Each structure stands twice: as structure tokens, then as C-alpha cells.
Design a protein around this ligand. Structure first.
Ligand SMILES: *SCC[C@H](N)C(=O)O
Ligand SMILES: *SCC[C@H](N)C(=O)O
Ligand SMILES: [Ca+2]
Ligand SMILES: [Ca+2]
Ligand SMILES: [Ca+2]
Ligand SMILES: [Ca+2]
Lengths: 93, 93
């Protein structure tokens, strides 16, 4: 209904798209996230330029420490990136 | 561009819509958030049914403790609610 909900549904749809598309529906693996960020985000992952950047990114996300990235971990990634994004736009950093 | 980005932009647009519409552009107050959640979310805030629910909700959000809700606080609210939402759909809770 509301646009905010549309956004929330979008996050659900993309997470489900990848977690659902491969492996466990509610768990995201290195290979899979590597695909989801590239398919959805370009500049964010691309900015690192490093090939091991994906590995570096996922280690931080695995608060859980199970070697996998979880929907909650992913959720904070997009949200924190969202606030950081607006900050980048208005603010230099 | 990508749908995920569209969602991120939507979160930015709604936060900015309210924080920007009233008071400080980067700070959300009780009165204002009361308006943003109702305008964007219905069932989430409505479910509490209590009138003081807004107050109860904001206290948790003010990690900062400044009596205001910040974009980052709001960001985690929608994100955590997003994962909790999908959980509600697939899962009973
Ligand atoms: S987070 C904002 C990033 C910007 N639109 C860009 O990368 O072009
Ligand atoms: S978080 C999912 C909530 C559901 N769509 C509803 O409230 O109807
Ligand atoms: Ca998966
Ligand atoms: Ca994990
Ligand atoms: Ca404001
Ligand atoms: Ca605060």
C-alpha cells in the first residue's frame, strides 16, 4: 500500500529473491550475496574495487558468526547503507 | 536504478518527507514521527491500539537518548520491522 511498505516489500523481495533462489530460503551465502549485491547494488560493492571486498563485507555482517549472512544481517546492511547513503548525498561522507 | 535502490530512496524520501517537512531536516520528533508512521504505516502502529503507543515506541528508538528519533534510529526501525514483517508472513510471529 504505502510507499514505505513498498520499499519494505522490495527488501523482502530481493532478499527472498537470492536466499530463495539459492540454498536456504532464509540464509544468504557468500556466493549468493555476491550475486544479490551486484544485481541490486553497483557502486556500493564496486567502490571497494577489491575482489576480496565481498569477503571483507560479509565478515562484518556475520554478527551471528555462522559463516553466513542472515536476513537480519542483510536488513541492517541495507538500512545502515541507506542512512549512510543520504549522509553521503547531503554530507561529503 | 535497481529496485533495492528504489527502496532505499523511498526510505530516504519518507524520512526526509517528515523530518524535512517539520522541525530539523535530520531529526524526527514525537509529533512528527506520529505523523510519518500513520501516513506510511497503518497496521504496525495501529496494532498497538494504545494512544501512548507512540511514546512507548519512540523511547526504544532513542538509543541516542536525546528525546528525539534520529534517521539512523528510524532506519533500524523500518529495517528491523521489515525482517520481522517477513517473519510474520512466513512465520506465525
Ligand atoms: S548513496 C548515494 C550514491 C550516489 N547516488 C552514487 O553512487 O552515484
Ligand atoms: S508484516 C506483514 C503484515 C501484514 N501484511 C498485514 O498487516 O496485513
Ligand atoms: Ca539462500
Ligand atoms: Ca550469520
Ligand atoms: Ca524533523
Ligand atoms: Ca535520539
Amino acid at each position: 500500500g504505502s510507499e514505505l511498505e513498498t520499499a519494505m516489500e522490495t527488501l523482502i523481495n530481493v532478499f527472498h529473491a537470492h536466499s530463495g533462489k539459492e540454498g536456504d530460503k532464509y540464509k544468504l551465502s557468500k556466493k549468493e550475496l555476491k550475486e544479490l549485491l551486484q544485481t541490486e547494488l553497483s557502486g556500493f560493492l564496486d567502490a571497494q574495487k577489491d575482489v576480496d571486498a565481498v569477503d571483507k563485507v560479509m565478515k562484518e555482517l556475520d554478527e551471528n558468526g555462522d559463516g553466513e549472512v542472515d536476513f537480519q544481517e542483510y536488513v541492517v546492511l541495507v538500512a545502515a547503507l541507506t542512512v549512510a547513503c543520504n549522509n553521503f548525498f547531503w554530507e561529503n561522507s
